[PDB]
Amino acid sequence: SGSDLGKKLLEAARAGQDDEVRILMANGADVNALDRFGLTPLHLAAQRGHLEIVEVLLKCGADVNAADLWGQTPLHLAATAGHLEIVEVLLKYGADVNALDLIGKTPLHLTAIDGHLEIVEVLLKHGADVNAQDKFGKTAFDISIDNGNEDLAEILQKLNLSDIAHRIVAPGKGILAADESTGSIAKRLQSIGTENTEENRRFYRQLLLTADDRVNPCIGGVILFHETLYQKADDGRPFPQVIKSKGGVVGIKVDKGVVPLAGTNGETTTQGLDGLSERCAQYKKDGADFAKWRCVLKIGEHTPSALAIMENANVLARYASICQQNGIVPIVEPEILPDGDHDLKRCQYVTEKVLAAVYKALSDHHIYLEGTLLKPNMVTPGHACTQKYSHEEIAMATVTALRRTVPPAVTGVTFLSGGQSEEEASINLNAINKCPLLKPWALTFSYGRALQASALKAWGGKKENLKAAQEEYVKRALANSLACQGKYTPSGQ
Amino acid sequence: SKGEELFTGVVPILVELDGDVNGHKFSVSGEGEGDATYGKLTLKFICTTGKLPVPWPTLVTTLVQCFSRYPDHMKQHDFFKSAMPEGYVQERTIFFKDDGNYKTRAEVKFEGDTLVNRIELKGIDFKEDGNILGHKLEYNYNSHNVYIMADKQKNGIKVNFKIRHNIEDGSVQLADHYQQNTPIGDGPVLLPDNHYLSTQSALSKDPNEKRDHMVLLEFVTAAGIT
Numbered sequence: 221s222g223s224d225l226g227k228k229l230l231e232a233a234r235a236g237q238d239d240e241v242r243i244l245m246a247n248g249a250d251v252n253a254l255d256r257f258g259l260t261p262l263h264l265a266a267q268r269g270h271l272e273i274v275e276v277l278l279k280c281g282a283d284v285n286a287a288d289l290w291g292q293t294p295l296h297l298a299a300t301a302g303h304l305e306i307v308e309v310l311l312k313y314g315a316d317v318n319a320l321d322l323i324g325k326t327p328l329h330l331t332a333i334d335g336h337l338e339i340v341e342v343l344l345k346h347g348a349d350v351n352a353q354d355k356f357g358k359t360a361f362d363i364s365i366d367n368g369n370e371d372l373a374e375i376l377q378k379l380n381l382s383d384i385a386h387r388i389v390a391p392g393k394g395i396l397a398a399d400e401s402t403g404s405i406a407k408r409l410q411s412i413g414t415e416n417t418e419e420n421r422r423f424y425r426q427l428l429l430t431a432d433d434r435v436n437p438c439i440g441g442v443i444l445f446h447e448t449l450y451q452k453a454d455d456g457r458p459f460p461q462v463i464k465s466k467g468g469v470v471g472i473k474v475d476k477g478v479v480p481l482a483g484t485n486g487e488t489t490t491q492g493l494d495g496l497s498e499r500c501a502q503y504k505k506d507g508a509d510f511a512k513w514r515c516v517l518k519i520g521e522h523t524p525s526a527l528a529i530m531e532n533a534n535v536l537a538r539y540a541s542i543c544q545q546n547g548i549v550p551i552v553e554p555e556i557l558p559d560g561d562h563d564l565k566r567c568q569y570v571t572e573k574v575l576a577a578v579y580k581a582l583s584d585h586h587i588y589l590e591g592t593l594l595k596p597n598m599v600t601p602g603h604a605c606t607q608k609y610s611h612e613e614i615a616m617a618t619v620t621a622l623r624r625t626v627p628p629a630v631t632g633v634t635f636l637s638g639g640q641s642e643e644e645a646s647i648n649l650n651a652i653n654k655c656p657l658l659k660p661w662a663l664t665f666s667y668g669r670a671l672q673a674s675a676l677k678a679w680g681g682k683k684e685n686l687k688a689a690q691e692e693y694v695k696r697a698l699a700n701s702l703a704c705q706g707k708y709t710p711s712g713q
Numbered sequence: 714s715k716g717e718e719l720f721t722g723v724v725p726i727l728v729e730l731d732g733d734v735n736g737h738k739f740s741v742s743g744e745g746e747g748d749a750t751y752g753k754l755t756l757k758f759i760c761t762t763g764k765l766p767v768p769w770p771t772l773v774t775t776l777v778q779c780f781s782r783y784p785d786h787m788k789q790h791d792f793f794k795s796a797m798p799e800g801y802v803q804e805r806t807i808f809f810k811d812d813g814n815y816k817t818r819a820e821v822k823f824e825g826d827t828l829v830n831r832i833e834l835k836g837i838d839f840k841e842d843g844n845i846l847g848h849k850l851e852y853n854y855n856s857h858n859v860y861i862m863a864d865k866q867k868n869g870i871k872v873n874f875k876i877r878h879n880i881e882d883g884s885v886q887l888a889d890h891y892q893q894n895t896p897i898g899d900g901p902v903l904l905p906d907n908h909y910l911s912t913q914s915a916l917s918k919d920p921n922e923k924r925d926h927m928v929l930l931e932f933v934t935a936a937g938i939t
Contacts, residue, residue, distance in 0.1 A: 289919055290930050322915035322930045334751050
């Protein structure tokens, strides 16, 4: 009658006898009963589906994170059979959200394999691990595809691809562009006094990465090359394992050369469409979360016309339809080369025509705008122009030209150097953030020449100049990190 | 099917194993639970004899294998739930490279409310310094694929799948399986086509136990037609 209080308690909690649990808890029974299997009564109160039994055990002194022989916390069984009112109660008394069993799977993975809808949104509110792996190397994205879910294979990916963008265009970080291929690094390494070998291209990239620790909060993304990822450092650690260890995202150059058109006047395109579905499944496992899609655009007499705009409107949208289905964040870079001669009234007119067709095709190919990045070029006059302009007139027409086409759903908007000077590119960037206009998106730096110009002339080509080349990179990393916030005063520069 | 409605909820599973190799008599008696709706296996094998000569990772895909998670478009290609609650005789003959061979005979059936299955493991001609008997393997079991074919001769399903095991030297061991499931009753028996499933097992220990055991946690999930 009154013997074996732990054996009789599991029987009432398994079937659902609500008139028997209160009697046992009112006499003097143990709430944390451990039998031969060590299964606490909290598991049977949440696996079958009885919210009334859970509300009684939690008001006495039951362990919410009680692990059994299989290491399965009661949070796993609460979101297994398909119950929402039970999971919301266990998350209020401080439960282990990152629970790991024998394999090492968080409770978030069980909500996608079974078929939960509103239960997934509850675990993502308190704070769950997005890129949670285990002994097999499968996250919450490579499993729901083979199952056959519609509200889980397309909605869950909208949060993983967007959370990475917050750690790149953050107010204080930046993007380090350094994807010099074999047909571009040999030009800069020719007039200095060096050659183009495999050792020179590998040692040059290690100087900008493995340096002082004062550039971690200033660099959020590093752009590399496909050959760079297949190379290691002199210490013994790979390149992607160093950038992510200090607070950065590893990139890779995927676009190839250019292909001239027919019947035009110098209009070219960007090569890198074939074989895209086979490269995104491999670069994601290495540690690459984004890329760099650079195009070639110029302003002449009639270029661009009604052909280069329509052609580039579909290429920029087709690339973002495959990388989002794996784990690569597409970055559109509508770079316009300021060639010829033009003023601010003409350069801004061409910018509003090209950017108007970018987001037009993105709303048709199902492109998540809240998880992509844009890298537009500045509105600067040509080099052959005779009329000079101040730093305030350039930043005035730059922000206005972006608010007409770029939607506020973009996480961050970057810029380029424009082929100008190293110091001039940093002064014009500060005037953009100080413009008296409400900017819904964020601004940062993403130069591909000004961030490494001082680290090349003073480097020479020896081995004893390693401490002298990394010193100039610290001054350039702190100068561009303050121009994106509005607190940058040019003192002696 | 009419037998698929009986697997709704938690059904207790009783493991009754009794093998004999090289004159060594051993018996394994375990118990646990299962789930066929979402595909969850929770068992606790307890060695009643003590020092088991045969290793543990080589005796994982033995009993159960009936609470799998089948998709909504693969309910007509079932065989484990078609002979219920009549049952079926599951006979296997596991082969190896250059060592020995196994011979099991399972009778997956219900006796009222608890799944009771008996396996008479046989087979002779083994070694005293190989992977079997001698403790040389590790304590881990990775994922493997199980291919299910079809047969229309003796009214059954000829399941053929090849798995692998790990060791502590660097070699690769390959095994061969020839499962032949024969039903007992003469009721409605379905004929599935060709499809493969998945296996996500997990082995661990238990500090609250002095005798030998094996905490198995397998996750079976079906895929599609190959």
